[PDB]
Design a binder for this molecule. Structure first.
Ligand SMILES: [Mg+2]
Length: 258
């Protein structure tokens, strides 16, 4: 039994930011997620390094320090910068985890690899040894499918080919692709040898992750798998129904057993 969460946090670009961080932290605390995957995690280019490449007030780092307020459980942070973002931010992705790790990677899944290009996207992977199996978790934030300088297929192939093994690869995040609207581009995702935990789930809700208040209701965020899994549940979270809103995207919360 393992519980996963993925959430595009729109870091430091949200109104009411501190309360929203607090909501997120409190939730992670109650639920005790094994792995949290986060996209649009920002830090100010001009702030001091704390350590590695992480600058003061990095959203993820703040989240973690807030998390410590509500749980004794040791959480670990792995973050990677992608490109120069909104304003004077570094935009990146992160993974938080309850578990210690065997491996960590940060790499570009895109052809663009310059911090000066919006379409350069770095991925963060984590390897956990769990119940005598090695599992790789990937936090992803992809470009629009129609993006004329990146091939989403190729990019996904880069992620999947980063390690050459027969490990369970779990691949989490914002894919900028509506499973309802642009079906051909969502089908294309799966063509890469991917299984969608939403579809595989025993219990599920409507699955909507972005709401612009059916005209404007979308499913843009996912949790994919390279193998078929026993997926007990797949709920949306932080949507003012199951927990308060913390971003401009809602999060996905998935329960897997193995
Ligand atoms: Mg956004």
């Amino acid at each position: 039994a393992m519980k996963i969460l993925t959430v595009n946090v729109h870091a430091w670009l949200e109104e009411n930011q501190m309360e929203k961080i607090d909501i997120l932290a409190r939730t992670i605390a109650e639920k005790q997620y094994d792995v949290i995957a986060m996209q649009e995690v920002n830090q100010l280019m001009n702030n001091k390094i704390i350590f590695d490449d992480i600058r003061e007030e990095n959203y993820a780092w703040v989240l973690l320090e807030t998390l410590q307020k509500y749980t004794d459980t040791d959480y670990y942070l792995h973050w990677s910068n992608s490109h120069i973002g909104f304003g004077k931010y570094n935009e990146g992705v992160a993974v938080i985890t309850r578990h210690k790790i065997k491996a960590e990677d940060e790499f570009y899944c895109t052809f663009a690899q310059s911090v000066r290009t919006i379409s350069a996207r770095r991925i963060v992977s984590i390897t956990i040894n769990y119940e005598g199996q090695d599992i790789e978790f990937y936090s992803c934030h992809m470009n629009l499918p129609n993006c004329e300088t990146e091939d989403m297929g190729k990019n996904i192939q880069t992620i999947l080919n980063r390690t050459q093994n027969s490990n369970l690869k779990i691949l989490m995040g914002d894919f900028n692709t509506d499973a309802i609207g642009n079906v051909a581009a969502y089908e294309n995702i799966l063509s890469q040898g991917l299984f969608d935990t939403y579809v595989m789930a025993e219990k599920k809700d409507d699955g909507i992750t972005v709401d612009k208040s059916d005209k404007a209701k979308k499913r843009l965020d996912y949790i994919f798998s390279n193998k078929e899994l026993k997926v007990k549940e797949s709920k949306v979270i932080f949507n003012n129904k199951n927990k308060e809103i913390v971003s401009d995207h809602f999060g996905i919360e998935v329960k897997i057993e193995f």
